[PDB]
Design a protein around this ligand. Structure first.
Ligand SMILES: *[C@@H]1O[C@H](CO)[C@@H](O[C@@H]2O[C@H](CO)[C@@H](O[C@@H]3O[C@H](CO[C@H]4O[C@H](CO)[C@@H](O)[C@H](O)[C@@H]4O)[C@@H](O)[C@H](O[C@H]4O[C@H](CO)[C@@H](O)[C@H](O)[C@@H]4O)[C@@H]3O)[C@H](O)[C@H]2NC(C)=O)[C@H](O)[C@H]1NC(C)=O
Ligand SMILES: *[C@@H]1O[C@H](CO)[C@@H](O[C@@H]2O[C@H](CO)[C@@H](O)[C@H](O)[C@H]2NC(C)=O)[C@H](O)[C@H]1NC(C)=O
Lengths: 221, 51, 51, 151
């Protein structure tokens, strides 16, 4: 269905377009991550062949490689050219790569690597660098008591440090999701810079905010 | 009680005797004299009957 | 302006299809007019709305 | 101009010949109030509705009706210390809203301030918009298990 060669036996680095080398079809939203083995960081350098639809400020296609497996997690670069990529890193093992495609757009693709084991220097959570649990735990099922106190059960951080916990509700296959807030109370009501609860979509991209419940009340989605 | 009016010691338009009686009236409410003065005059002469 | 080098004016015609421009006054030689008129067909920009 | 840089205009917007401060324009009255039901409550909304719009209650509606009838712009600022205000010990300071009124960080105190003797010497009050007292709660009489000789 989606992207092709994905294999990760320490992974080598071969993340490629979903027909490469060919013309990739319209309307794909492939959602690449690579966040294991916490030493190595990042090196893209999509090897030598590169043509995606050159638009004026790129506007149709992108190859957004923002670091950290989401849409909010900070932007690094946008890629739409016909010239080989920018050979980069972002000090961490955290990544998210999209491959958007509107309707009438083709010509070549990419094929990636990572080829790395570096490490940074400064401490973040305690230690040499402490490659922090990117606050998270997945859960499937058909009923959740998804809680902000599993943080209080196991935070894997220090009390008094900023938290960024994201869940990933899967499914029971071929269905939808109905979220409803049983309990809801934030400390600083109506502040929305230092506290909120947000519900995106499938495929966590920043262009998918269903809701950004931040003030006093949260209703169902 | 339907409406809420209020009686009040008047004064000319702009006077120090507006404010320094307000200090004096508020003391008599909390001392209990202003209620005790009410039960001197508004107390009736023998109604009780125990209903 | 058409791109000077290539015969691939599909980056141009994707904008005009999206920009709601149904009336075009092309200034080309007939060698290049045939090449745009094939690429205006593959873009689906040759309905009965255009001129 | 420079093709690498662009327009670097050296007219970098120094001090303008129009500079007038305010003392009577609106001054935007910093109305100190406290949060207590049903006088002042937060809105029951989901979107980030803020400013002055996030408050709700009886005591908010009094401040809004004064703004029309007197022509001012109110700006609700909740008190940092959650007390009304009381005379302290040997310290002898005020603690809360009446402290904000002396300090002139508060032009107004639209809130349940109980007008009393120790506050009237120190700040001043408008005439009462609501009169109250001390009354009694009790059970409403129930279905009356009547005893046992109720026949
Ligand atoms: C002689 O001189 C130089 C090198 O010696 C060549 O380059 C020309 O000059 C500038 C390069 O700085 C080009 O103009 C700029 O183009 C930018 C867009 O580039 C994208 O798109 C083009 C195709 O349109 C691609 O070629 C390119 O790789 C990118 O994909 C614009 O963003 C620039 O706009 C703004 O730039 C700065 C602000 O940062 C300011 O100058 C302005 O405010 C401006 O708004 C700018 O337009 C120019 O296009 C280059 N020429 C050509 C033909 O492309 C010359 O080519 C070289 N040879 C000749 C024959 O002149
Ligand atoms: C953009 O314009 C400024 C305004 O003159 C240029 O020069 C300044 O030069 C002074 C003199 O030492 C220095 O303080 C700074 O280097 C510049 N800026 C400011 C705010 O003073 C500046 O050189 C121009 N930019 C470029 C890239 O040439």
């Amino acid at each position: 269905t989606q992207c092709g060669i994905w294999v990760r036996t320490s992974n080598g680095g071969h993340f490629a377009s979903p027909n490469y080398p060919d013309s990739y079809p319209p309307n794909k939203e492939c959602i690449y991550i690579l966040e294991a083995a916490p030493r190595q960081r990042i090196e893209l350098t999509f090897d030598e062949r590169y043509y995606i639809e050159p638009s004026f400020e790129c506007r149709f296609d992108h190859l957004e490689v923002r670091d950290g497996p989401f849409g909010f997690s900070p932007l690094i670069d946008r890629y739409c050219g016909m010239k080989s990529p920018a050979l980069i890193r972002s000090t961490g093992r955290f990544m998210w790569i999209k491959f958007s495609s509107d309707e009438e757009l083709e010509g070549l693709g990419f094929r990636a690597k990572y080829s790395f084991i570096p490490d940074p220097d400064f401490t973040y959570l305690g230690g040499i660098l402490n490659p922090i649990p990117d606050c998270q735990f997945e859960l499937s099922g058909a009923d959740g008591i998804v809680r902000s106190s599993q943080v209080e059960q196991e935070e894997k951080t220090k009390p008094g440090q900023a938290v960024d916990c994201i869940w990933t509700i899967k499914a029971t296959p071929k269905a939808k999701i109905y979220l409803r807030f049983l309990d809801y109370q934030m400390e600083h009501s109506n502040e929305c810079k230092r506290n909120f609860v947000a519900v995106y979509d499938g495929s966590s991209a920043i262009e998918n905010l269903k809701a950004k419940f931040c003030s006093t009340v949260a209703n169902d989605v | 009680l339907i409406d809420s009016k209020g009686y009040g010691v008047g004064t000319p338009m702009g006077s120090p005797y507006r404010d320094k009686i307000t200090i004096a009236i508020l003391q008599l409410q909390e001392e209990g004299k202003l209620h005790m003065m009410k039960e001197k005059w508004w107390r009736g002469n023998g109604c009780p009957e125990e209903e | 302006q058409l791109p000077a080098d290539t015969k691939d004016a599909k980056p141009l015609l994707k904008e005009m299809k999206r920009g709601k421009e149904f009336h075009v006054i092309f200034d080309c030689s007939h060698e290049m007019a045939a090449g745009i008129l094939k690429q205006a067909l593959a873009m689906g920009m040759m309905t009965e709305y255009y001129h | 101009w420079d093709p690498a840089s662009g327009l670097n205009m050296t007219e970098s917007q120094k001090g303008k010949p129009a500079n007038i401060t305010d003392s009577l324009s609106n001054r935007s009255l910093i109305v100190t109030t406290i949060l207590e039901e049903p006088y002042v409550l937060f809105k029951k909304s989901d979107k980030p509705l803020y400013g002055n719009d996030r408050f709700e209650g009886y005591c908010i509606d009094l401040l809004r009706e004064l703004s029309t009838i007197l022509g001012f712009t109110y700006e609700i600022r909740l008190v940092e210390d959650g007390k009304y205000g009381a005379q302290d010990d040997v310290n002898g300071q005020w603690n809360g809203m009446v402290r904000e009124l002396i300090d002139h960080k508060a032009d107004l105190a639209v809130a349940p301030l109980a007008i009393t003797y120790v506050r009237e010497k120190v700040i001043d009050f408008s005439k009462p918009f609501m009169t109250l007292g001390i009354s009694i709660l009790y059970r409403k009489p129930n279905g009356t298990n009547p005893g046992v000789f109720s026949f």
